[PDB]
């Protein structure tokens, strides 16, 4: 079956190199001209670059030219995307996509048709060490009907971290909202459950945070304070 | 250089109904041969993206009969002649002619259903906020339709921006509601000056626009 | 050879007319961009500054050289570095330390402009392998001096039907000097001798002229 | 452990036919009279050389040798070269296989082509990026060792890929004895019989006999004295 494995991702510092490689299994890999479409942090795609037929490239973004630089491999059936001179803004998804129409087969040469596309791989591009999250309160407004309360996990990075309530078991009327990020690259974002009033001066509620790369796993007893 | 767009935006769709979508160009896409280059490409969510309609009109391999495409010059358009619950996500349309080639910002395809209006409250920093610099406010919405609604962050009549962001899930797969959440950021130096601070939220399901507010000194 | 819109097409060791006759083994195309007219510089046995080190050629290199233009196209990108002729030299770390690769100012400079070179290496006696241009197959006539082209053997005689029991991946036979005594033929797999066509020298036989005209032959 | 390889080796170079002709070339042969290396499977497949082509005999009367594997780096890296043999497959295959040590079951890629009671003795060279395994099938009836005579060694297939090859490795079935010897560029002298199959041949570069024997152009030589090279 056809494959497309990518790999070269990782946390690179602004103004270095990497090497994305895209392989590709089960298919004739010369009669397909390939493609390297990016895809930015919840955002819409964004074609970036191409390689016909004949290791010929077909040009690159208009914001990106100047850096990128492409090769093709028939014999080895691999593509290679060379990454020079980065910034912060090229953070994001990378997928190698391959055209559709075999070539000679029908004008000029066929280039559209993504149609096959691989798990893309995870670059990401900052400047700060490893911290640890910071856990803070969001007890209930003390105000009818059901009160929210939540825990506002701040400063960390990197990704992911897991937030749950009650060690678990609350799963009804939970929500958490996707990372959002910061001035200084160091993230933040939040959970929170809403729980009816009259459970929130006497009940028990507990939101706990993991953090696997800085191996922690706090507890933080959440209640109405005055 | 060829900028396209999209229209609508975003259209709520119910199971059942046909569904149509515009993509626009600059240029027209007539090449020689007479066949116009645009492509129509689905994304699920979470998944990777995959391909729906190539060149013009050609129904792509393996995807069913549900699909129309029509038009040529600078408009196209895209109607499933019946739309399903598995027929949700983001659509782009890509052109083929000029190089480099572009994607469009997409349409934001979901399920429609009756509208609700939005529960709001709001959140003061902490005691672990006083002993550190930085002060943090956070407004909540939950349970709201449709994806439109907007914040005001507001002190003293004297209006914020840049410092205060925001961010809203996933789309309830039971009562399909949105929630968003915004948060402002200060040191501690203006925060324990300004007395009143108001979220103020303006959505459809509302007769005005909603203000909770807080005063500081309990 | 008669469509010469490319600028350089030079075959050697074969004469461009006598193409269309010759069932060769195998062809390589091996194509690469390089700028200004090194086609002079790649040449069999010479030297020069791309051939000493990127891409040399043989002494008896039974093939042909192709180059033209592609202005229209290339206008940084395009890169160049005691080696065997035809060799991939990948191995290009930076070696104190400088640059292994130097660049090509892709422009509209002749003077320096891009171009296309395409090497067509043929072998034709290198294998049982066939590769012919356009001709057309006859019926072979038996048993008469006549003359015949197998494929690319060229020879004149008359074709015995032979029982030679050549093993099965033999294709064709012979003896103590260069004589082709046997051949098995393409389209129906059979061993026919070949006997070469009858030939000796006249004698004439004669008394004087001053006794008579008459004469004999032997 | 090792053995005796009495006249092993030589098969046929041209594929021209000849007649009832002593035919003198030099190629790339088994010396004659050489140190074939056993190789006993009791409690056996290490990576072995493969500097000049390789004459690889297989002695079998239970069938558990499976194929080889050629190549120089051997994990995902290069097209490593692969012969399998199960109950209806012969695959050649040169893709980049993952699978470090022995890959079957007892009980990237560029390319692909499908088809002590015997002897099948195979040789493997590589030239021009033509690899070519000519092999040959014999019936014995022995428990011991190599035997001792003469047979052809017919030319079976040529593969199109071309690749440095400096080590293989044999593989067989999870849950015998084999010989392996090397080649060398001599000169023999090869005596095409009457159906053009090679009968004998000689080696000239043994010792003095086989010499003059390759120089005279015949199988034997009357008495006197023969001048044949240049000491230098
Ligand atoms: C040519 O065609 C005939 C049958 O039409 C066939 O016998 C023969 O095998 C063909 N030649 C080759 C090389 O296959
Ligand atoms: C091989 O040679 C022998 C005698 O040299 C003769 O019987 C025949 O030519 C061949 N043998 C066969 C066909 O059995």
């Known amino acids: 079956q056809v494959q497309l494995l990518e790999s070269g991702g990782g946390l690179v510092q602004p103004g270095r190199s990497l090497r994305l490689s895209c392989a590709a299994s089960?298919?004739?890999?010369?009669?397909?001209?390939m493609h390297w479409v990016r895809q930015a942090p919840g955002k819409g795609l964004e074609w970036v670059s191409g390689?016909?037929?004949?290791?010929?490239?077909?040009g690159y973004a208009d914001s990106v030219k100047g850096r990128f630089t492409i090769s093709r491999d028939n014999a080895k059936n691999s593509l290679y995307l060379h990454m020079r001179s980065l910034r912060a803004e090229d953070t994001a998804l990378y997928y190698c996509?391959?055209?559709?129409?075999?070539?000679?087969?029908?004008?000029?040469?066929?280039?559209?048709?993504?149609?096959?596309w691989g798990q893309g791989t995870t670059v990401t591009v900052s400047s700060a060490s490893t911290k640890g999250p910071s856990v803070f309160p969001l007890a209930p407004s003390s105000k009818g009907g059901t009160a929210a309360l939540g825990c506002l996990v701040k400063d960390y990075f990197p990704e992911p971290v897991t937030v749950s309530w009650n060690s678990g078991a609350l799963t009804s009327g939970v929500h958490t909202f996707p990372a959002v990020l910061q001035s200084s690259g160091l993230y933040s974002l939040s959970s929170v459950v809403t729980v009816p009033s009259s459970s929130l001066g006497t009940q028990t509620y507990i939101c706990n945070v993991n953090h696997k790369p800085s191996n922690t796993k706090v507890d933080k007893k959440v209640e109405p304070k005055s | 250089d060829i900028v396209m767009t999209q229209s609508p935006l975003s259209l709520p769709v119910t199971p059942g109904e046909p569904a149509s979508i515009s993509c626009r160009s600059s240029?027209?896409?007539?090449?020689?041969?007479?066949?116009?280059?645009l492509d129509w490409y689905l994304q699920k969510p979470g998944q990777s993206p995959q391909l729906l309609i190539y060149?013009?009109?050609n129904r792509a391999s393996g995807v069913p009969d549900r699909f129309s495409g029509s038009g040529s010059g600078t408009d196209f358009t895209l109607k499933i002649s019946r739309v399903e619950a598995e027929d949700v996500g983001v659509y782009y349309c890509?052109?083929?002619?000029?190089?480099?080639?572009?994607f469009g910002p997409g349409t934001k395809v979901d399920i429609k259903r009756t509208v609700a209006a939005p529960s709001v409250f709001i959140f003061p920093p902490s005691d672990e906020q006083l002993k550190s610099g930085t002060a943090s406010v956070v407004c909540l919405l939950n349970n709201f339709y449709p994806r439109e609604a907007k914040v005001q962050w507001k002190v003293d009549n004297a209006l914020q921006s840049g410092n205060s962001q925001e961010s809203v899930t996933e789309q309830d797969s039971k009562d399909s509601t949105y929630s968003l959440s915004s948060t402002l950021t200060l040191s501690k130096a203006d925060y324990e000056k300004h007395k009143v601070y108001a979220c103020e939220v303006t959505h459809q399901g509302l007769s005005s626009p909603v203000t909770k507010s807080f005063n500081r000194g309990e | 050879y008669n469509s010469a819109s490319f600028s350089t097409f030079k075959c050697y060791g074969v004469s461009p007319t006598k193409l269309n006759d010759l069932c060769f083994t195998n062809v390589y195309a091996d194509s690469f961009v390089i700028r200004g007219d090194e086609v002079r510089q790649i040449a069999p046995g010479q030297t020069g500054k791309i051939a000493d080190y990127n891409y040399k050629l043989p002494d008896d290199f039974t093939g042909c050289v192709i180059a033209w233009n592609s202005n229209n196209l290339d206008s940084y990108n395009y890169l160049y570095r005691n080696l065997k002729p035809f060799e991939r030299d990948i191995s290009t770390e930076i070696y104190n330390c400088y640059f292994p690769l130097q660049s090509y100012g892709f422009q509209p400079t002749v003077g320096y402009q891009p171009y296309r070179v395409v090497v067509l290496s043929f072998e034709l006696l290198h294998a049982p392998a066939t590769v012919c241009g356009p001709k057309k197959s006859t019926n072979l006539v038996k048993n008469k001096c006549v003359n015949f082209n197998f494929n690319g053997l060229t020879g004149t005689g008359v074709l015995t039907e032979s029982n030679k029991k050549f093993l099965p991946f033999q294709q064709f036979g012979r003896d103590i000097a260069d004589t082709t005594d046997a051949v098995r033929d393409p389209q129906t797999l059979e061993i026919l001798d070949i006997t070469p066509c009858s030939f000796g020298g006249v004698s004439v036989i004669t008394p004087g002229t001053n006794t008579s005209n008459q004469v004999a032959v032997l | 452990a090792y053995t005796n390889s009495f006249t092993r080796g030589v098969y046929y170079p041209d594929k021209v036919f000849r007649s009832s002709v002593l035919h003198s070339t030099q190629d790339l042969f088994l010396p004659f009279f050489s140190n074939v290396t056993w190789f006993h499977a009791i409690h056996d497949n290490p990576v072995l050389p493969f500097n000049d082509g390789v004459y690889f005999a297989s002695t079998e009367k239970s069938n558990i040798i499976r194929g080889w594997i050629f190549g120089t780096t051997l994990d995902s890296k290069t097209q490593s070269l692969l012969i399998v043999n199960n109950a209806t497959n012969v695959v050649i295959k040169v893709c980049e296989f993952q699978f470090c040590n022995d890959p079957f079951l007892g009980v990237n890629c560029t390319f692909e082509y499908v088809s002590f009671k015997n002897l099948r003795e195979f040789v493997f060279k590589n030239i021009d990026g033509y690899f070519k395994i000519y092999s040959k099938h014999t019936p014995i009836n022995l428990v011991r060792d190599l035997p001792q005579g003469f047979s052809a060694l017919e030319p079976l297939v040529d593969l199109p890929i071309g690749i440095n090859i400096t080590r293989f490795q044999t593989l067989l079935a999870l849950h015998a004895a084999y010989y392996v010897g090397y080649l060398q560029p001599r000169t023999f002298l090869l005596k095409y019989n009457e159906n053009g199959t090679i009968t004998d041949a000689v080696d000239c570069a043994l010792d003095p006999l086989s010499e003059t024997k390759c120089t005279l152009k015949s199988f034997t030589v009357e008495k006197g004295i023969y001048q044949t090279s240049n000491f230098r």
């Open positions: 240029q027209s896409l007539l090449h020689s041969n007479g066949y116009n280059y």
């Open positions: 060149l013009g009109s």
């Open positions: 390689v016909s037929w004949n290791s010929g490239t077909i």
């Open positions: 890509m052109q083929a002619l000029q190089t480099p080639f572009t």
């Open positions: 996509a391959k055209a559709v129409e075999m070539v000679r087969g029908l004008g000029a040469d066929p280039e559209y048709g993504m149609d096959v």
């Open positions: 089960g298919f004739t890999f010369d009669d397909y001209a």
